[PDB]
C-alpha cells in the first residue's frame, strides 16, 4: 500500500536532474522507479523541479481534469519535464521507451490535507 | 452519428488561425464547435496546422496511448496548439474556459483506412 501522494512522487518527480540526460533517460528511469516491474507502464511524465515547486502547483490555477473533476491545477509557469512513452518495438519484460524532453505547464490533481499532488493529468 | 474522423476534425482542428487570438479564444471556439451544447467539455485541444499536417502524424512515430493501445503517433515536430480547460468558475450553460497557447508535439490515435486521426491523446 503506497499513499497516493507517495505514488505521485515516485512516478513523477525527478528533482535530481535539470533535464533528460540522453535518449536512454526513460528506459533507465522507468526501470528504477519500478514502473516496469510486472508490466510496462505505457506513458509516464517526470518533472524536473523541486518537490516544493511541484507541490505549490496545488495553490495555482484551478482548472478541470480531463476526467471532469475539479481538483486539478495548472502551474503558472513552465517546468522542465520529460515524457516517457513505450515504443511500438517494446514488449514486457523488455520494456522500450522514447524520451521527449520539454518545458510545459503541468496540470496535477490534488487531494488530501496536506493537500498535495496525487495524479499527473497533463502538461501544456 | 458522426464518423470518428469527422469528430476529431471538429473537436481538434483549427487551421484558420496560426495561434490563439486572445484569452477568449476557448470560450468562442468551444461554443462554435458545439462542445458546450448539452454539457461543458472539460478539456479540449485545438491544433493550428493544416489538416494535412495533422493527418500525416499517422505515419510518424508509433508510440503507446495513455490507455495502453498501440495506434498512437507522436508528431516529429512541434505544432502550434491551444489547450482549452474549464475554469473553477464555469457552470453549464455558462461555460468558462482558460486558453493556453503553446507549441508541442501532438500525439494522436489513428484508425480506419483511410487511416486518419480519431482521438487526441496528448501533447508533449
Ligand atoms: Cl503521466
Ligand atoms: Cl483534448
UniProtKB/Swiss-Prot annotation, chains A, B:
Task: Report the main location listed first in the record.
Answer: secreted
* Biological process (GO), any one: defense response to Gram-positive bacterium
> Changing residue 119 to A: reported impact?
Loss of activity
Question: In the UniProt entry, which residues are flagged as the active site?
Answer: 12 (proton acceptor), 119 (proton donor)
Query: Cystine bridges: which residues?
Result: 26-84, 40-95, 58-110, 65-72
Please describe the organ and tissue distribution of this protein's expression: Pancreas.
Q: Look at the named UniProt entry and state the broad enzyme category this protein falls under.
A: lyase
Q: Does the keyword Secreted apply?
A: yes
Keyword terms of this UniProt record: Disulfide bond, Endonuclease, Glycation, Glycoprotein, Hydrolase, Lyase, Nuclease, Secreted, Signal
Describe the function of this protein.
Answer: Endonuclease that catalyzes the cleavage of RNA on the 3' side of pyrimidine nucleotides. Acts on single-stranded and double-stranded RNA.
Full protein name: Ribonuclease pancreatic
Organism placement in taxonomy: Eukaryota, Metazoa, Chordata, Craniata, Vertebrata
Amino acid at each position: 500500500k503506497e499513499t497516493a501522494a507517495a505514488k505521485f512522487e515516485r512516478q513523477h518527480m525527478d528533482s535530481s536532474t535539470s533535464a533528460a540526460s540522453s535518449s536512454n533517460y526513460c528506459n533507465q528511469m522507468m526501470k528504477s522507479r519500478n514502473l516496469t516491474k510486472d508490466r510496462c507502464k505505457p506513458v509516464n511524465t517526470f518533472v524536473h523541479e523541486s518537490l516544493a515547486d511541484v507541490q505549490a502547483v496545488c495553490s495555482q490555477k484551478n482548472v478541470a481534469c480531463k476526467n471532469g473533476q475539479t481538483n486539478c491545477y495548472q502551474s503558472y509557469s513552465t517546468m522542465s519535464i520529460t515524457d516517457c512513452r513505450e515504443t511500438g518495438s517494446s514488449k514486457y519484460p523488455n520494456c522500450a521507451y522514447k524520451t521527449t524532453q520539454a518545458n510545459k505547464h503541468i496540470i496535477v490533481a490534488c487531494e488530501g490535507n496536506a493537500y498535495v499532488p496525487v495524479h499527473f493529468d497533463a502538461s501544456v
